[PDB]
Design a protein around this motif. Structure first.
Motif: not given
Lengths: 226, 46, 95, 226, 226, 226, 95, 45
Positions: D74, D83-85, D87, D101-104
Motif C-alpha cells: 500500500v 506504507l509499512r504495517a 505496530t 496500514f492494517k487490514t482485517q
C-alpha cells in the motif's frame, strides 16, 4: 499474515463437515462450541477484532467492557503513558510511582484513584446473529473441519464405533494442518517484515516503544551523514 | 570535496539520494587527509 | 578458482513470498523466516517420505583448489631459490 | 517460475479424476471446494492475479476491493511512498510520523485521515461463469487430482470402503507430488535469477527497496571506474 | 545431451505398452494425457522446440504466442538488451530504469509503453496431427512406458486387481528409470563441456552474458602474452 | 576396451534365450526391441559406428544425416576449427564471433550463414536385412540375455505366473552382469591407457584439444633438455 | 600433479535449467538453487531406491602427490647439504 | 527414567561474547579516530 481475513458465517464449516456420512448429526450448536474451542486453542491474534474503548477509574477500580477477551495495552487518557502489569501486593491498601494495572474479570485494578484510561483490547467478530464469525481461509476451514472431525471420531472411538486406524489417521491429518494453520496465520507479510526489519537494525537501539502504544516499533532509524 | 569530507554518490555508482541519511546515503571516512598532511607538513619544515 | 558454492533448497520459503524478497530480507536482517509446515513437507512430516528431505543440512560444491595454488607457490619459491643458489647470487646478496 | 501459467477450465480436473471408477461420484461442487482448498494450502503466488486499485481514505479507514485476498503493498497516491504495517495499538484514538496500514476484513485501517492510496493486491483468475480458473501445468493438475483423490479415499477409508494400503499409497504419492509442485512453482526462472543476482551482488548494499515498489530490487548495481 | 532427439509419433509407446496383457485397454487418448504428464513432470528442456517470435507492446502489455510454454529470454528488438523479471509492484500505475517484464497467461507485462520485443520461448514439437511428438530415445520410451504402467497399476491396485508386490516392483523400476532418463537428458555433451569449460576458467570473470542472449557464455577467454 | 567388437547377427541372442523353456515365446521382434532398449540404456560408445559426413549450411540451418544418433564434433570444412555448443537464445534472429552449433531433429542450427561443415557422428552397425547388429562379446550377450529374461519375467510376475523369488534372482543376476558389462566396455586398454598417460602427465598443460579433433589429446608432451 | 577433482552429480539441477547457466549463476551468486523433489529422486524419497542417492555427499578424486613432492624436495636439500659438506664448502662459506 | 537422571539444567545466555565484541569494536573505532586525527597512541604519551 500474508492473506486477508475475509469473514464468513459459521455454517460454512457445516457445508464441509456434512459431506462425510459419519458427521451428519453435527449441528450449529456443536459447531459453535468446537469452533470456540479451536479459536482459543490456536490463539491466533489476527482472528480477533482490535477495539479501543475508554473507561473511568473510580478508586483503583474500573468497569471493563463486555466483549473483552485480552488487553493489548492500557494507558492514561491525558498523558498517553502506557501502563504495566502490577507487581504490587498492596495496591489499594494503605498503611497507618510508575502506574500499573491488573485485570481479572469485569474489573480492572489500576494504581490511580480518579482518571480515565484507554484500553486497546481484542474481541470476536460477530454476525448479524449473536454468533462467532470465522475466517474463510481454506487452511483455517480445513483445520477446523479436522478439529471437529477428530473430536467426533474420538467420541465414536470411545464408544467403539470407529476403527483405531481411522482415528489415528484423523489425528495425524489434524496435527499437520494445525501446524500449517499456525504458520499461515503467524508468518509476517512483506509490509510486516519491513516493520520487523526497522525494529531489528538499529545502530542506536530503541527500547521504549511500550511507553507509546508501540507506535514507533517499526519506524526506520535514520542516521545523519557527517 | 573528498578532501573536505563530502562524498558524491554519483562519482562511484549510477544513482537510480539528495537526503543526507545513511539508510540510502553513504558515510565518508577521511583517511586520505593524513597522507597529504604529512607531506604538506614536511614542505613547511624543509 | 571460485569459492564455495552452496546448494540451497527453497522448499521451506513461506507461502505467498517471492524468493527475491525473501532473500533480500534475509540479507538485511540475517534472519530468514521459514515455514516447516508447508504442504510440500507433508510426506516427510507424516512418515510417507524419507526424513532426509527435512534434515541433513545443505550440500556444498567445494573444491580444494587453494591447496593446489599453495603447492604451486611453494614450488615457485623453491625453484627461484634453486636458481639463486646455482648462480651464486643469494637473496641477501641481491639486496 | 520457469513456465507460464496458461489458464484452463475447472472440469479439466474432473476429466482426469473420473477416469478412476472409484471417483465417478465427484461433481463440479467437490472440484470447486477442493480446488480452493488446494490453492490456499499450496499458497503459490503465481496462481493469483496481480491487480492495482486506488481507494480513498475517509478518516483512518478505507473501503477494500471485493476480490482482494492478499496485499502486496500500500502506498500514497501523490508521493508514492509505501506504507509499512501498523505496530500501534491506539492508532486513530486521540488523547486529551511514518505512515502505516492494517487490514482485517473489507476495511483498511491506515494512519492518515484524508488521502488516496494505491493497493497492489492479488486475486483469483475467474471464469466467465464466475468460477475459479486453474493452471494447466500438468504437475499442478496431477497434484490437484491426487489431492481430491486423497480426500475422497480418506472419506471412504473412514467408512471402511478402502483398504489401508490404498490410502497409504495415495498419501505417499500426493506428498511427493506436493513437493514437486512446490519446487516447480517457486524455483526462480532465468530472468528471476538475474533479478536475484543483481540483488545479491552489491558493493554498496541497497536496503530501501520497500520505499519504492521493490522496483529497483533487481536493478544492477554499477560502480564507476577510476 | 550426448544423443540426438530423433522424433517419432506417439503410438510408438503403444507399440510397447500393449505387449503387456494387463495394459491392453490403453488408448491414444490415455497415451496423450500420461505423456504430457510425464513431459511436464520431467521438465527436460531438450524435449521442447526453441522458437523466437517478435511482438509489439501497446502500453506495458503485449499479446503472447499461442504455443508458448516457457520464456528463455525477452529483449528489446532495436537495442538487443535483454529484460529481467519485474520486481515492481506498481509498474503501469502512475502517481499524482532498467527494463523488465512479467508473463502470466497470454499477456506479457513489460515496463515499456510502445516497443517491439523479441521473445525466445519453448514449445512442443507437434505431428502432422495436432498431437505431441516424442523422442525415440529408448531410455525415454522405457521410462514413459513405465510411467503409464505405474499409473494404470496404481488404478488397478486401488481397485484391488493387482498384487501390492507387483505395484511395488513397478514403482521401483520406474523410479530407477526416471533417474536414468533425467541424467541422460541433462549430462552435457563434449561440445557442451567445451562451453562449460570456457565459462568456468576465466582469469577475468564475465558476468554480463544475460544482457546478450547468453551468446558469449561459452566463448574462450584469451589472455594476451606480455 | 581391451577386446575387439566382432559383429554377429541378432538371432544369436534368441539361440541363447530359447534354451530356457519359459522363454520359448520370444520372437525376433521382441529381440529387436529389447536389444535397442539395452543398447541405449547401457549407452556404450564402442557399440556405435564412427562416421564422418560433410553437409552444407543454407542459412544457419543444415540437413542432418539419416542414421545419426549422437554427434562427436562439428567443424568447418575449410579451416578445420571445431564448433562448440550454442549458448545463445537469439542465434539467427536479427535486430533493427566464435562459431557454434545446435541439433534437435534432422536439422542442425549453426551460427554461420553459408558454409560447409564436417560432422563426426555415431550410428548403429546394420545388417544386410537392415537390422541392428550386436557384438559377440559373451559378456554383452549374457547381459542382453538377462535383460530380455528380466523383462519377460517381470511381465509374467505381473500376471502372477512367476514366483517372486525367481524374479528377484533374475534382477540380481542382471544387475551384476550389467555392472560387469559396463566395466568391460569402458575400462581403457593398454593403448588407450598410453593415450591417457600422455594426456595426464604434462609439464606444460594442453587445454586446447577441442580446437583440433582431440587429435593431440594422447600426444606425448616432450621437453627439450638444456 | 593436478588439483582435486570433484565428482558432481546433476540429479538435482532444477527443471528447465541448462547446466551451463546453472553453474554460471552458481559462480556469480555462490548459491545454486536445487530441486530436492525432482522426478528422478522419487525412488529415494519414496523408499523404493537406496537412500544414499539423496545423501553421501560428493566424492573426490584426490591423489596425495603434494607429500611426494615435499619428500623429493627434502631429499634434494639433504643431498645438496651432503655434497657441500664433503666438498668442505659449507653454506655459510659460500656467502 | 529421566526423572532420576538428566542432570540439572542451566539458563545460560552468551552475553560475555557480546560484551567482548562491543569492547573490541570500541578499541577499533578509537584507533581509527586516532589514525584519522593523525595523533597516534604512542604520540599521546
Amino acid at each position: 499474515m500474508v492473506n486477508n481475513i475475509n469473514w464468513v458465517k459459521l455454517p460454512v464449516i457445516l457445508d464441509r463437515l456434512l459431506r462425510h456420512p459419519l458427521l451428519t448429526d453435527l449441528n450449529l450448536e456443536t459447531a459453535i462450541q468446537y469452533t470456540l474451542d479451536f479459536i482459543s486453542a490456536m490463539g491466533l491474534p489476527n482472528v480477533y477484532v482490535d477495539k479501543i474503548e475508554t473507561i473511568d477509574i473510580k478508586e483503583y477500580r474500573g468497569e471493563l467492557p463486555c466483549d473483552l477477551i485480552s488487553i493489548n495495552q492500557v494507558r492514561l487518557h491525558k498523558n498517553g503513558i502506557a501502563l504495566r502489569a502490577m507487581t504490587d501486593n498492596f495496591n489499594a491498601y494503605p498503611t497507618h510511582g510508575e502506574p500499573s494495572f491488573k485485570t481479572q474479570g469485569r474489573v480492572i485494578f489500576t494504581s490511580i484513584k480518579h482518571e480515565k484510561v484507554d484500553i486497546s483490547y481484542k474481541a470476536i467478530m460477530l454476525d448479524d446473529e449473536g454468533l462467532p464469525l470465522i475466517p474463510d481461509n481454506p487452511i483455517f476451514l480445513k483445520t477446523l473441519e479436522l478439529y471437529i472431525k477428530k473430536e467426533w471420531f474420538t467420541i465414536l472411538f470411545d464408544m467403539g464405533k470407529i476403527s483405531p486406524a481411522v482415528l489415528n489417521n484423523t489425528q495425524q491429518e489434524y496435527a499437520f494442518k494445525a501446524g500449517q494453520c499456525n504458520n499461515e496465520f503467524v508468518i509476517p507479510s512483506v509490509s510486516e517484515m519491513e516493520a520487523i526489519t526497522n525494529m531489528w537494525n538499529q545502530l542506536i537501539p530503541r527500547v521504549t516503544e511500550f511507553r507509546r502504544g508501540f507506535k514507533n516499533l517499526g519506524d526506520k532509524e535514520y542516521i545523519r551523514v557527517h | 570535496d573528498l578532501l573536505n569530507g563530502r562524498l558524491h554518490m554519483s562519482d562511484l555508482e549510477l544513482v537510480l539520494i539528495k537526503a543526507a541519511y545513511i539508510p540510502d546515503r553513504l558515510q565518508h571516512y577521511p583517511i586520505m587527509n593524513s597522507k597529504l598532511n604529512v607531506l604538506r607538513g614536511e614542505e613547511s619544515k624543509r | 578458482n571460485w569459492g564455495s558454492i552452496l546448494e540451497l533448497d527453497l522448499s521451506k520459503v513461506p507461502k505467498g513470498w517471492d524468493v527475491g524478497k525473501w532473500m533480500y530480507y534475509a540479507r538485511v536482517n540475517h534472519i530468514a523466516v521459514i515455514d516447516s509446515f508447508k504442504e510440500g513437507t507433508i510426506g516427510a512430516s507424516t512418515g510417507k517420505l524419507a526424513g532426509a528431505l527435512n534434515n541433513a543440512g545443505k550440500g556444498m560444491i567445494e573444491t580444494n583448489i587453494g591447496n593446489y595454488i599453495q603447492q604451486q607457490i611453494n614450488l615457485l619459491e623453491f625453484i627461484k631459490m634453486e636458481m639463486a643458489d646455482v648462480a651464486g647470487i643469494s637473496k641477501q646478496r641481491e639486496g
